[PDB]
Design a protein around this ligand. Structure first.
Ligand SMILES: *[C@@H]1O[C@H](CO)[C@@H](O)[C@H](O)[C@H]1NC(C)=O
Lengths: 44, 49
């Protein structure tokens, strides 16, 4: 199961406490050992 | 590859039949398709199971 918790709170990171709630529940079966990220470039 | 020459004035046993074979398997994924769970009414203020 691949779990994701998330929260979007409006305002180097600051200092405080905020608990994150479940977002999805995904019965995938997938194994993970590595990952990457994706960014939106500047072109115009 | 030969062809079936289906005409309506054939005999049963030479007429076309549509077949749908189903196949179930449970490889390793710990959830997927399963049928419906029925739910009855609901009472209140009673000791119930
Ligand atoms: C994930 O990898 C392990 C070996 O590191 C393997 O034994 C296991 O079966 C894999 N899990 C799945 C769901 O394929």
């Amino acid at each position: 199961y691949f779990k994701i918790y998330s929260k979007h709170t409006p305002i180097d990171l600051p200092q405080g406490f905020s608990a994150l709630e479940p977002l999805v529940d995904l019965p995938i079966g997938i194994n993970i050992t590595r990952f990457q990220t994706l960014l939106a470039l500047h072109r115009s | 590859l030969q062809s079936y020459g289906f005409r309506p004035t054939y005999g049963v046993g030479h007429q076309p039949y549509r077949v749908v074979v189903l196949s179930f398997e449970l490889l390793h994924a710990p959830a997927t398709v399963c049928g419906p769970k029925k739910s009855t009414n609901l009472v209140k203020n009673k000791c119930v199971n």
